[PDB]
Design a protein around this ligand. Structure first.
Ligand SMILES: O=C(O)C[C@H]1CCCN1
Length: 164
């Protein structure tokens, strides 16, 4: 069902997370972590303190889909086990901010064709699939986008609820 999911999404904030490759999203799914550049790190840290849930929605560039969405369980922290990210052409490992811990809520894909009716007021009402890495998605658009994903029966939101 969707009731616990809607409860997790109640009054949450949403952010569009864009990755250049599937490998980083796969590491994120396996290890429950995400790392980004400081300009986004700062935004995500602010949002984590401000809202009951901060939801990251992942899309791999050029894939035409979203790959799932997760909930921030921590602010960024430095000095863990180094994560073997596949870094973009210009970027090195010292250029990243800290590591966020995330709980996946859905590891299933959603094709852009299914979200074409969803516009993001915080990006000029362009379709929600359009946006830079870190773009915030307005509450109602983000909520309906998460509800479009196929249910992930591998995930039990009982555990995530207990962290809010
Ligand atoms: O957020 C960024 O722009 C950088 C990438 C590196 C690992 C995953 N995020």
């Amino acid at each position: 069902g969707t009731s616990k999911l809607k409860y997790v999404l109640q009054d949450a904030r949403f952010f569009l997370i864009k990755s250049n490759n599937h490998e980083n999203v796969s590491l994120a799914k396996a290890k429950g972590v995400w790392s980004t550049l400081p300009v986004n790190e700062k935004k995500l840290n602010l949002a984590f303190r401000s809202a009951r849930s901060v939801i990251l929605i992942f899309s791999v560039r050029e894939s035409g889909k979203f790959q799932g969405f997760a909930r921030l369980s921590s602010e960024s922290h430095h000095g863990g086990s180094p994560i073997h990210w596949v870094l973009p052409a210009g970027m090195s490992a010292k250029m990243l901010g800290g590591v966020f811990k995330i709980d996946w809520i859905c590891r299933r894909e959603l094709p852009f064709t299914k979200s074409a009716h969803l516009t993001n007021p915080w990006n000029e009402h362009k379709p929600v699939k359009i946006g830079r890495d870190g773009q915030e998605i307005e509450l109602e658009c983000g909520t309906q986008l998460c509800l479009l994903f196929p249910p992930d029966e591998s995930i039990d939101l009982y555990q995530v609820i207990h962290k809010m």
